[PDB]
């Protein structure tokens, strides 16, 4: 929307993501990033699992769970989006390779610009009348890629050249992230309470709950098939289970009139909660295994 609250929420979200990603940049080194780029095994596995089987899984879920055209289209669009920045946080939460995580995120976000319209054209035949090709936000994708890439370089430069300041930088980031998270939560709660509780089909909730768990399991099994270390398996699993929902929300809000988007009003918000809740559950399971094995 064009309300001042929405733009304020977007600004605070951008600040939060910038500071989070700058804080995460510490655990990255240019040598390991270059090595992972030079011989791509986990990157290839992640790209395959992202744009070869996940869209198929979304299509099959739309067919099995009897869903309407708009719900099936929303699930399909969510099954084609890049990983997003939640995968980096999840990959840091468990012991895993972080250089490979940022390589995965950057490569997937860059390949989306050329891979996402083709998948949409292939799969939307029969559930959408028209052309979704030029509704893809190319400018938004490029802006997101730039706003993810810049804090990486800033943090890595700060670590490499001036380690003296980086305790201060970490503490400032950790306080700013908290200060932004509380405000964003308050704004989102205010919007949810003041808006009408639009009804949602229960099958949509079941699909949105099943969808990221399928992603996680697929990523881990695929990484296990080709002999890889535990850290690489975990990081590729977290990137395979995490998807960017703002792109799907933008496409949905630009491709449908307001009177048709009723059933899908809370879908982007609900999808984010499910992968956050299921992502944290797997983090607890892994940590409990390590201590009490």
């Amino acid at each position, epitope marked *: *929307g*064009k*309300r001042p609250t929405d733009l304020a929420l977007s600004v605070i979200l951008v600040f939060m993501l910038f500071f989070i990603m700058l804080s995460l940049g510490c655990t990255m080194e240019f040598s390991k990033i270059k090595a992972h780029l030079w011989k791509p095994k986990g990157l290839a596995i992640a790209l395959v699992a992202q744009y070869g089987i996940m869209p198929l899984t979304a299509f099959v879920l739309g067919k099995v769970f009897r869903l*309407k*055209n*708009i719900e099936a289209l929303a699930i399909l669009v969510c099954g084609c989006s890049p990983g997003g920045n939640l995968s980096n946080v999840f990959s840091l939460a468990m012991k895993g390779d972080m250089n490979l995580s940022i390589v995965m995120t950057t490569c997937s976000t860059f390949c989306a610009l050329g891979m996402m319209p083709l998948l949409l054209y292939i799969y939307s035949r029969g559930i959408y*009348d*028209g*052309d979704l090709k030029d*509704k893809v936000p190319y400018k938004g994708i490029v802006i997101s890629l730039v706003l993810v890439l810049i804090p990486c370089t800033i943090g890595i430069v700060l670590k490499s050249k001036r380690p003296q300041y980086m305790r201060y930088v970490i503490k400032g980031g950790m306080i700013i992230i908290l200060l932004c998270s509380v405000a964003v939560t308050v704004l989102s709660a205010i919007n949810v309470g*003041k*808006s*009408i509780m*639009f*009804a949602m089909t229960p099958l949509l909730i079941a699909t949105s709950s099943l969808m990221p768990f399928i992603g996680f399991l697929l990523g881990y099994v695929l990484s296990a098939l080709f002999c890889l270390n535990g850290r690489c398996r975990r990081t590729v699993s977290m990137e395979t289970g995490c998807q960017n929902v703002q792109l799907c929300s933008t496409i949905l809000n*630009v*491709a*449908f*009139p*307001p*009177e*048709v988007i*009723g*059933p899908l009003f809370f879908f982007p918000l609900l999808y984010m909660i499910f992968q956050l809740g299921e992502g944290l559950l797997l983090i607890a399971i892994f940590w409990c295994y390590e201590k009490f094995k």
Partner: antibody
Amino acid sequence: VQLVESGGGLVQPGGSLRLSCAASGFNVSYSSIHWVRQAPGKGLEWVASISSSYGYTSYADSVKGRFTISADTSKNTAYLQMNSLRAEDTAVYYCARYMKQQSQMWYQRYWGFDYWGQGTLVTVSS
Amino acid sequence: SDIQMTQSPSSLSASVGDRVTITCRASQSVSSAVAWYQQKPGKAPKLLIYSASSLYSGVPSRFSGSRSGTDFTLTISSLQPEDFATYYCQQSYWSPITFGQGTKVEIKR
């Protein structure tokens, strides 16, 4: 705000016909236009909808694949093209515009149809 | 792939000044996306109530709407000689828009 429809007439079964909806007082490009059918002696029947700005187009199950809806911003008109017409398609066709969403109140959704056309009669007989 | 909307009273008989209630039942949740229309013989339909409870501008205060779950009702407080017509129930939440069967209000005798 007015909706004027034309193009109704008599066609042979399996033929083709195109209906027009000349709108006044508003822009068809930024509005949603619906076509409603009323068979003689029966109730109302939704057919198709067009939203030019969003590139959105929907059809009923009965007419899917045979009907095509379009809109022209230059002439401010909306068109419905009917192909392979059957004897079940004889009716009076109405042009309807959806409620205009109000930006001053972002929360209400205003579900309904504001304005209707006089209607044009289409008969399909050999 | 449509949402059936059952208009229970297919024909109603009433006199001038009586209170008339017409109910509409939705086969699935459609939120508050229900509108009511009034059609007279040989004329186009006219909107009366949008969003299942709001009175459209220019419609007299007699007409009213209410929603109770998937159940929607249309009420006329005092019937007038110009209120004898056919009324239609519509839903607009899902992509295939569906109407009600219809209810014709006639003069009792």
